[PDB]
Enzyme design. Structure first.
Site, short mmCIF file in Angstrom:
data_model
loop_
_atom_site.label_atom_id
_atom_site.label_comp_id
_atom_site.label_asym_id
_atom_site.label_seq_id
_atom_site.Cartn_x
_atom_site.Cartn_y
_atom_site.Cartn_z
N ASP A 179 0.83 -1.21 0.00
CA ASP A 179 0.00 0.00 0.00
C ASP A 179 0.87 1.26 0.00
O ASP A 179 0.53 2.26 0.63
CB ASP A 179 -0.96 -0.02 1.20
N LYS A 225 2.07 4.66 -1.17
CA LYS A 225 1.53 5.82 -1.89
C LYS A 225 1.84 7.04 -1.01
O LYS A 225 2.19 6.86 0.15
CB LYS A 225 0.04 5.66 -2.13
N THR A 260 -4.96 0.97 -3.72
CA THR A 260 -5.51 2.11 -4.44
C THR A 260 -5.12 2.03 -5.91
O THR A 260 -3.94 1.92 -6.21
CB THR A 260 -4.93 3.41 -3.85
#
Ligand SMILES: [Br-]
Ligand SMILES: [Br-]
Ligand SMILES: [Br-]
Ligand SMILES: [Br-]
Ligand SMILES: [Br-]
Length: 275
Positions: free
Chosen positions: A137, A139, A178
């Site tokens: 994850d 980001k 995402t």
């Protein structure tokens, strides 16, 4: 594994909110016995076996187990864990300088400012990957600054909610972050390994240098389709005074075949990065 079941409010005072996700909220807090400050992450538990609300105990225990392993200046650390009927409460290191995402939003950077962030991210991921931990994850929202009011802010990688131990080179679970940042193997539901993080680092680097997101479509499905097709390019308007070596670094990360993608070790030896 069970956690401390005393009321967390007997040991901590909470204050301002620091972050807010789908099944979690993070509050600044202060430990009564020491005066030391932390971030309390309240994760909502699943109330039934088959619910879609809350986080499964298996998933919470995985995040906690991974967090317990880590001690490195560029990754968040775990202090204590509490729980009650409703929540697991992680007492985490306080990182008070805000998201890299919000820092970027005030500011695009110089290549030096970008590599200064990027090198810390690479060091943190090198540590994680050396422990066979895939973050899954990465980001800008999950990179936090210690102090945003210095010219070269120090950072920590946060949010281990999707992190997995990769002890057989790949894992085959329900894992999906995402759309803007996920690797093609995630989009295509293929076995996943440490390589997925390296793709995400490529996306982050593109954004750091340009202020623009390389695969972003008008809807999530478009973004995912773009990722799977490796549908990105370096817009001259954004990259005209960015070095070709910087572009080379990105190009070697945004590679569909995970085997041909740069590893974290490759990325640290790449001529744009290597001292
Ligand atoms: Br506060
Ligand atoms: Br490694
Ligand atoms: Br977190
Ligand atoms: Br999207
Ligand atoms: Br790697």
């Amino acid at each position: 594994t069970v956690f401390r079941q005393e009321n967390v409010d007997d040991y901590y005072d909470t204050g301002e909110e620091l972050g807010s996700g789908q099944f979690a909220v993070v509050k600044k807090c202060r430990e009564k016995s020491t005066g030391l400050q932390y971030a309390a992450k309240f994760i909502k538990k699943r109330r039934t076996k088959s619910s879609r609300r809350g986080v499964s105990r298996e998933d919470i225990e995985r995040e906690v187990s991974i967090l317990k392993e880590i001690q490195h200046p560029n990754v968040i650390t775990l202090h204590e864990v509490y729980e009650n009927k409703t929540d697991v409460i992680l007492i985490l290191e306080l990182v008070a300088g805000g998201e890299l995402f919000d820092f970027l939003a005030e500011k695009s950077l110089t290549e030096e400012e970008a590599t200064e962030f990027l090198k810390q991210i690479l060091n943190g991921v090198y540590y994680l990957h050396s422990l066979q931990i895939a973050h899954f994850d990465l980001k800008p929202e999950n990179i936090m600054l210690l102090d945003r009011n210095v010219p070269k802010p120090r950072i920590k990688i946060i949010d281990f909610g999707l992190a997995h131990k990769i002890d057989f080179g790949n894992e085959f679970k329900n894992i999906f972050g995402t759309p803007e940042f996920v690797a093609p193997e995630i989009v295509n539901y293929e076995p996943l390994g440490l390589e997925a993080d390296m793709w995400s680092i490529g996306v982050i680097t593109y954004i750091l240098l340009s202020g623009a997101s390389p695969f972003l479509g008008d809807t999530k499905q478009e973004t995912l389709a773009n990722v799977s097709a490796v549908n990105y390019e370096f817009e001259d308007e954004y990259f005209s005074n960015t070095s070709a070596l910087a572009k080379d670094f990105i190009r070697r990360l945004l590679v569909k075949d995970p085997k041909k993608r740069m590893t974290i070790q490759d990325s640290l030896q790449h001529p744009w990065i290597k001292p």
